[model samples]
Target chain A: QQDPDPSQLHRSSLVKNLQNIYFLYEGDPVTHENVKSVDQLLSHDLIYNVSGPNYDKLKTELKNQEMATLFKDKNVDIYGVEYYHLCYLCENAERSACIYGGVTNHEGNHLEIPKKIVVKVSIDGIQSLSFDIETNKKMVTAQELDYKVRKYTIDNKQLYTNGPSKYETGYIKFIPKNKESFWFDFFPEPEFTQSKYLMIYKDNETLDNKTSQIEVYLTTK
Target chain B: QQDPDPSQLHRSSLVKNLQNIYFLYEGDPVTHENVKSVDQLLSHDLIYNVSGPNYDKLKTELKNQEMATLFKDKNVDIYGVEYYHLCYLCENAERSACIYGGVTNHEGNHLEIPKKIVVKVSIDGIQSLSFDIETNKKMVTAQELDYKVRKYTIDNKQLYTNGPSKYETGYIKFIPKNKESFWFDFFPEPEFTQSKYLMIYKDNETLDNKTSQIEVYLTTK
Candidate 1:
């Protein structure tokens, strides 16, 4: 049996909360720069305020635990503001643009897309899925297996999982206004990412931060 | 500010599936034992079959991911059956008590007990809570600060959180038939461990595996 060769592996939690991070002047968009990956966007404006209860103590305690989980080998007991997110919108007109992100105020019917996957795959070293798995708007790859999803609800702007059992696929959410589309699987809140659902994208292509007129099919097989 | 020093920390998912694992011969009970902690119980009768679909692939994939999460600083790619659980059954008269585990067949109503918690506390090295949090059956302690839970439903054998702005507590579930009581907090399915819900159990406790007559209040503080 042929195993998979996967690329662009991303954690589900991080990807789910991903928003188009950009600079906003007043109430309108000002500067538009391209980001190669999520990491670049996060590091661009490396400044944020800790949200949630007990800003000081909670942040400290959380920092301790974070240190423990991520780095347990050393005796690291330093308190710091660890978790953060890019912000959007600045009330001040004269001040610098709020380099924030959480999602834009794009108009139109928003769709939920399975844009990323996290394998709770407990197996030891296999941090990725096999190459054979993928999703798309079109179905039937030829011979007999198209490997395309069957149902594409353009109205609801949602893609239901291709229920063939074998050669399965996840769904995608299409938003016309923001010009954005996300890939996702599972109906439940904390949905599982099946490797088969991730839309196959070329390594050279950029994940269109500013959504242009995109097609429904993930990449016609 | 005094930080919390928590005890008996267990993962949420693992603790959820915990059942009263014991030995059963035919359709009857055979042997009984007491466990000090969850770890002790899991360590006994380590034999088990890999369950879930695609036992080979999924198991391997899961095992790999599990390995990746728990240990990444090593070049460990070796495959092995890492996850396991205790069993309790023996349909065969000849074979050694069918050491299987999941749950046991007990008469009477089975109520869900939250018996565990998990913290998303991602700060940097504090993997625990301060000592000020806890839950209990009895209300009012003393000095306008009893720190005990307000609601205690003995009929349903459930303990609701003592919702005082300062002192908060989680809920509990009790099973009279199994003689088992569990501590927990949170309402939604994937609840967070407030560190206030784990009923303070004594360090010297034999978690009654065989449901013996237990008390209602979780150590009336």
Candidate 2:
């Protein structure tokens, strides 16, 4: 028999919001790009999935540059340095988690130096995920923030299910420091019964001193 | 004195929804693309605007093909053929308005025939825009459906105000007759008290039999 109507699947409001997320880059003549939806960006292919092969490429590219040393001894896997991964760590270890990753400069150059990044997670839409810059240093070197941003994952069964589960939704703002490159990455709760994660990435100049905001929604995909 | 902060203006929810809209293509392995937003599509350059010069270029491009006659005698300006423009005509002339445009097939090749297109407008979010394919005719030519899909519009002022106005919110689907190349063009209500119409075009292959949908939202600049 044909499969049951896929529309019957359970999806949180947060998923809908995350799926419809949009990014605005403010400047002389403000510019914007529609993230459209999280479902559009997920796969083993780096070109399609924000957290795929490109992350490794970004890591390798950064390593060869003079900025590589700044992250020496640190887990430079860009994919490993994402918010949801941090949340996975905090939830599994019963402790907060943090990491560092390079952001691009105004000139579109990836700064060799990675910055300290942190995530605060709670139960639901009101307080699911919030990303912030954890350091006040004017010039943070990659090496100084090394080992801080690493990738980790929890078993599907270990993932949160209730009281603000992994499926919870929320919004966050990216405050820029000196027009350098920065990155934001996260995975939307799986769609329906499908376990594949929909990974998203906010890279480079997409975030700026002006319109540095991101809103998340849970959707029934 | 400097202009008041443009951000202070009241942008209807419809505007935000239209601005953040996205399109998803369905099939064997579903695909998608970020329509990007209208604000990013506009400029002093006319070539970029839907109602601008480039529409003629698209018309000419399609005309050179064997299927150009499918839309014969019909207004080639997709923007000019939009529901809102038709509404404007209706209100001004004290009569109903009608017109026709072409949509493609699964392969994005235009059908050498025509189909009936309809738009129903209501008050607010609870009763927003919904488009439907009213018929399936093989030998249907532009003349047979001559007055079927008439153009329409409302006065810029007569446009909705309290409830979702014409400019308030809605999305129209361009159902392809055969899967040939098709086009959809529209403008977001201007933000920041500026008159420049932000024009956008949805062309080719984005629509299909299973999942052809477009959402419109209003937003602040």
Candidate 3:
């Protein structure tokens, strides 16, 4: 049989907003609209993007130098970063992460930057996001962000066709008290101004065929 | 005194097809749907993206190894490649235009590419965009492929205000004859897909605080 339709693969929902871009984070998560400071940076898990109401303008005008300038203008310097995908973390991890890394320009080193050079950064400076809690709710009121995320499975699935949805993850859960201090990442769903959150829940039978149980949790690489 | 609102910059026009993208080109110019092969791969001026229906999908699903294999089960191979932006030739020139700078997946060593690397590529190995003159009506008929691209001056311009409506280049024009031939880049007018063409004209004055009459053409970099 064929593999499951990748296109149909379900992704855990994320909190979104009017901003065309996002920067995922940890301690004191500042998952809001636009970045403007170092206090706002965390472990360098930038889920950067180039889109928004000003998307066309942003993409057209924001080149490396200009982007460098833009980032600084935001009060933070985001140089020497890696693409989130290759990130040793979770696939969805960088989807919403940005931490103020330590690299910066000294007033006017309009110097050209290279791919992977200088500023010896600890590959482990960033962290992994296991699974993010991802959910939503109804009309009548219009301004409620309350939502829940249920993960169903899609194994034993077939492609080259259609309709083969739903599976269950045999993992544990985190039932929080009405007031547990879990740092939740909130975002507004696109097209509206409500909220959603990201809570990581570990899921797996065997993380991957590439290893053994010894490889329980894959950290930053 | 304000620069015409850069936001208020004049809008260029475009053509459309359910065709996922529109490539911009010169010589034997045919702004049709699809960029398909080696023969057509000769243009070095650039690789412009006129993102279409498949644009987002192309970007999202465009990822790695296992998936490369899986998708190759669907088709593609990204080997040593450059970031296009830092391309010595066109920067944006290199980007939109990945001319396979002589490299490929030799199916050997374990290579996890770098940022501004090497090789020429892009799906279907880049093709000569054929013409589909018989498409889209709302331009009033079976499409009028020819249109004027009026470039205006924003010099001695301010940068703050809202509506700095007009400026003229005060120059000559290059109207393609019925069969003289030219390539076009078709992007939507934000939403509707009529057609938009990129026609650059030579402009004047202090080309930059950095040049004189000698550097007339500041090609797209």
- Please state the i-RMS of candidate 3: 21.1
Residues A181-218 of candidate 3: C-alpha lDDT, one tens digit per residue: 22111222222211111212110011111111110111
Better of 2 and 3 by lDDT: 2
Model 2: DockQ vs. true structure: 0.02
Tell me the tens digit of each residue's lDDT in model 2 across A1-221.
Answer: 12212243233443432321111110011111111111110111111112232121111112111233333333212322322221212122333222222332222323444433554433343455544333223333232122122111112211222222344222222334544333222323321111112122211123332222222223212
Docking class of 3: incorrect
TM-score of chain A in every predicted structure: 0.18, 0.25, 0.16
Give a tens-digit lDDT track for model 1, residues B123-177. Answer: 1233222112221112111100111212212112222221111112222332333
Give per-model TM-scores: 0.23, 0.23, 0.20
lDDT of each: 0.20, 0.25, 0.20
Backbone clashes in model 2: 67
List ranges where model 1 is wrong by over 4 Å.
Answer: A1-102, A105-212, A218-221, B1-102, B105-214, B218-221
Q: What TM-score applies to chain A of candidate 1?
A: 0.18
**What's model 3's lDDT at B94?**
20
Local error of candidate 3 at residue A202 (angstroms): 27
